[PDB]
């Protein structure tokens, strides 16, 4: 049983597949131009350390909401870009958008530490509009993102220690 964080978020027939941490990490690793997208929930439970560890593997970070403050506070802002989740979605689905370095779009988008119902709609946008060239959107967050291509199952906040073991396995697999 896969439980979407909002039980009514049954969008349609193509539902996110449950993936191991190692498979989610290898998808980021296999991507030519991946993008880590983080939201306001990255500012909690020492989650920004994982984002920074991912970024330091050479992966740009889209810091949405007010997540940029935690990167500034943490002392890691290189290759981290402030942007709204909304405009980010519109830009990722736009084949003419040359990205944050001006070199091109992103083939893989991975979400982490985002407000569920907005992040989900950000994923549904890419799933339904970023089709050619195909952009793969995955979730390494604590939620079962039915709108992602691949995702973890729901991990309750009182089991956050379990989520951190799984996320750490994602980082080691990149």
């Amino acid at each position: 049983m896969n439980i979407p964080f909002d039980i009514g978020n049954i969008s349609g027939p193509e539902m996110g597949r449950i993936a191991t941490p190692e498979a989610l990490g290898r998808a980021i690793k296999n991507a030519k131009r991946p993008l880590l997208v983080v939201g306001s929930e990255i500012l909690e439970d020492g989650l920004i350390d994982r984002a920074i560890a991912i970024g330091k593997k050479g992966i740009p970070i889209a810091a949405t909401a007010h997540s940029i403050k935690g990167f500034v506070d943490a002392g890691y802002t290189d290759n981290v870009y402030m942007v709204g989740l909304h405009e980010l979605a519109n830009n990722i689905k736009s084949p003419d958008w040359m990205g944050f370095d001006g070199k091109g779009g992103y083939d893989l988008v991975a979400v982490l530490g985002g407000i569920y119902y907005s992040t989900s709609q950000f994923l549904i946008s890419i799933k339904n509009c970023a089709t050619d060239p195909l952009v793969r959107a995955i979730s390494i967050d604590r939620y079962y993102h039915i709108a992602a291509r691949m995702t973890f199952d729901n991990i309750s906040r009182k089991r956050t220690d379990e989520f951190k073991e799984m996320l750490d396995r994602v980082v080691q697999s990149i």
Partner: protein, 759 residues
């Protein structure tokens, strides 16, 4: 001829389509299919995932545009039907009346003049205006039938058109009630009334009104004045009827916004509940019955299976309700409804003494102890994902703070309780834990002032267009907030302190009034109610939003001497290029909120919404990187000029207060800002970005055309940053920028999107 008839009198679907394309060529439609299917016809259910076409030929994006068109049509119908209903009642109960907005206003109905070309003189002159709206509603609804429009873009234009009709329907409804009931007509010192869960005097008979139509509440107040009962009965409201009622009587009170409705009703403070239409809990009969409060339904939009006793004597209705053989009644005669409610609340007040509605201490203890701290039940059903289970266990262990914190984050929807097998009344358990804070919820709000005065337009016009007043900030909309009701208060506070013109309506205006600063004052107590920089103004209820449109139109007519008669496109283009403004519906929820945003967007005003706003599926987002999307004409000679993204977006959803506030400032930039005005706006944008995000925006130099545009205090450091971090050619010695800016500053640059305005 007060004015020459403009080109778009009583416009149909295609009459303003070219203006919509100007908007949409820049702010292109963006789609997030919350539902990837369509259920509207028996050929379905169609899967549209990935851009597929339905069984009727309609592709995914066009279905999303159809969906938002339906939403706007529902919202547009709600406002239009509200006004029609009020007008018909008024013309029959009180008669026709001359539209007199006072000597401080010459243009009685700017939007009516702008869209229909009509200069109304009496209330009865709004009948042809409503006739127009209602005819258009049916035309566009026809367009949403299977096998109609196939272009997503043309459907967005139909939604924009419906949004414009909504702004007209809002103006009619409010002008009508302002004139018919002598509500304030732009009063800068309008009275203050008590607001909040805790401002009600429970020792007096308490009558609760819920909805948007104030006509039955006028009869309540009128009956109370005639019988000398204004000091003996406590009359308070939830949602916009509360705003419109306090506009009629400064003796009434406001309980609060939609998020508070279920909790107040569940509290059982109300001896009688009188509802009308819109934003009423659909289970209000259940909830009233549970607290032994009779329900009086006064509008045919919402009967709840009750008997229509419009023709029965007030005596016989009271007997029935007092005796309990019916839990409520329908009374479509507002005069009779008012009499019944007032006579009934005095009787029920005595009969309801001795009842207990919220859990006792022991019951509360049993509830939190029996909770199983389920991993994914109540939290999954909750729209905000609140930690109810963990909060319950903390209370079982003797810590009720976690539960109490949830009261304000909760939006009173009741979904959590329905997935709880333990049958815990979660909504009432949070309330009990927060009872102390609920009872201390005692705020102060200025009454709905309605229209902006002509003298105020003349005072702020130039500083607003030039930019030295950094913008109109309009905090409006519903209370489906992501993180409680204090966010809208913090936005209003931050912008008024920075001398923006801060106006509010509906639930937003309510929620901003619940908080007090270090000196113990609500925003409405600390700041003046003038339409001016550094002032806080409660424009009024959700229909009063149209006064914001009207203010921007009057700026174009009074300060810029533009004709408005049937001249929508020229005025909208004026507002988009010169009137710094930004709407904020942090908790946008309803269909009325979608049509409000559409009508505001069509006249050239951007709107930010909360993270739940993705659920509307469609947004209007700019691509600041696409040069050809930001070309405007210099009306002096017809040349094309690439302009900074100002405003960058038209309808955009933000996730957190800390992202939203810098965004709002950003969305107030306009291409016609002078050096001092841009400098004012840029000082706030840069300082707000540093305050809330901890870093200056990555692309802030886009808003720098000359050194004079730079904030004064850090000008020298900004010049160095422009040189060494952005590679601009800047002479630090001479403190002058040589190259880098997007365009040269030209005070005479006459920016317009309209070829017909080229001279």
């Amino acid at each position: 001829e007060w004015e020459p008839m403009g080109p778009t009198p009583m416009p149909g679907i295609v009459d303003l389509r070219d203006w919509d394309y100007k908007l949409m060529d820049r702010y292109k439609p963006f789609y997030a299919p919350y539902c990837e299917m369509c259920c509207f016809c028996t050929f379905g259910k169609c899967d549209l995932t990935g851009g597929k076409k339905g069984a009727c030929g309609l592709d995914m994006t066009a279905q999303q545009a159809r969906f938002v068109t339906i939403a706007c049509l529902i919202g547009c119908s709600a406002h239009t039907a509200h006004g029609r209903h009020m007008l018909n009642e008024i013309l029959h109960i009180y008669g026709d009346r001359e539209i007199d907005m006072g000597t401080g206003i010459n243009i009685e109905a700017p939007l009516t003049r702008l869209i229909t070309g009509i200069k109304p003189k009496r209330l009865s002159d709004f009948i042809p205006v409503l006739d127009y709206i209602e005819e258009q509603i049916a035309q566009v609804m026809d367009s949403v039938h299977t096998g109609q429009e196939g272009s997503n873009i043309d459907y967005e234009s139909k939604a924009f058109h419906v949004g414009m009709l909504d702004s007209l329907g809002k103006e009619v409804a409010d002008i009508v009630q302002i004139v018919a009931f002598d509500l304030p007509k732009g009063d800068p010192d309008a009275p203050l009334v008590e607001i909040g869960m805790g401002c009600i005097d429970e020792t007096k008979p308490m009558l609760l009104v819920i909805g948007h139509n104030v006509v039955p509440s006028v009869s309540v107040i009128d009956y109370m004045r005639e019988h000398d009962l204004e000091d003996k009965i406590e009359v308070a409201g939830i949602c916009c009827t509360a705003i419109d009622t306090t506009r009629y009587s400064d003796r009434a009170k406001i309980v609060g916004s939609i998020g508070r409705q279920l909790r107040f009703v569940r509290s059982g403070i109300a001896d009688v509940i009188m509802v009308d239409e819109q934003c009423i809990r659909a289970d209000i009969l259940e909830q009233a019955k549970r607290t032994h409060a009779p329900l009086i339904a006064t509008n045919d939009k919402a009967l709840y299976g009750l008997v229509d006793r419009t023709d029965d004597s007030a005596d016989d209705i009271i007997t029935i309700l007092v005796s309990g053989k019916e839990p409520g009644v329908v009374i479509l005669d507002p005069v009779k409804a008012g009499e019944v409610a007032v006579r009934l609340v005095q009787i029920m007040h005595e009969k309801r003494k001795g009842l207990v509605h919220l859990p006792t201490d022991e019951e509360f203890k049993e509830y939190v102890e029996m909770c199983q701290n389920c991993d994914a039940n109540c939290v999954i059903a909750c729209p905000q994902g609140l930690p109810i289970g963990e909060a319950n266990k903390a209370a079982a262990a003797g810590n009720i703070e976690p539960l109490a914190e949830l009261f304000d984050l909760c939006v009173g929807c009741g979904r959590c309780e329905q997935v709880c097998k333990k049958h815990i009344p979660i909504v009432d358990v949070i309330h009990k834990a927060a009872l102390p804070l609920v009872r201390a919820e005692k705020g102060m709000i200025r009454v709905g002032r309605g229209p902006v005065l002509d003298t105020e337009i003349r005072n702020v016009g130039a500083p607003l267009v030039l930019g030295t007043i950094p913008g109109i900030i309009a905090i409006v909309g519903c209370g489906n907030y992501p993180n409680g009701t204090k966010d809208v208060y913090i936005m209003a506070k931050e912008f008024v302190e920075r001398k923006y013109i801060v106006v509010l309506t509906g639930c937003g205006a309510m929620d901003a009034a619940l908080y007090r600063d270090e000196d113990g004052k609500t925003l409405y107590e600390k700041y003046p109610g003038d339409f001016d920089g550094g002032c806080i103004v409660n424009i009024g209820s959700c229909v009063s939003n149209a006064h914001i449109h009207d203010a921007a139109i009057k700026v174009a007519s009074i300060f810029a001497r533009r004709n408005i008669r049937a001249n929508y496109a020229e005025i909208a283009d004026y507002i988009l290029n010169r009137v710094g403004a930004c709407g904020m519906a942090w908790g946008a929820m309803s269909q009325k909120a979608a049509s409000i945003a559409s009508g505001v967007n069509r006249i050239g005003i951007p709107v930010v919404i909360g993270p739940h706003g993705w659920k509307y599926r469609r947004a209007y987002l700019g691509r600041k990187d696409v040069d050809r999307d930001w070309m405007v004409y210099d009306a002096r000679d017809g040349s094309k000029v690439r302009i900074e993204p100002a405003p960058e977006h038209l309808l955009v959803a933000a996730d957190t207060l800390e992202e939203a506030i810098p965004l709002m400032a950003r969305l107030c930039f306009r291409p016609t800002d002078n050096s001092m005005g841009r400098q004012v706006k840029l000082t706030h944008y840069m300082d707000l970005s540093m305050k809330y995000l901890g870093k200056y925006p990555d692309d802030w130099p886009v808003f720098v055309r000359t050194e004079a545009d730079l904030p004064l205090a850090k000008k020298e450091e900004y010049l160095r940053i422009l040189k060494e971090d952005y590679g601009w050619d800047v002479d630090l010695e001479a403190k002058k920028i040589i190259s880098g800016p997007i365009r040269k500053f030209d005070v005479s640059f006459d920016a317009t999107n309209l070829e017909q305005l080229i001279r």
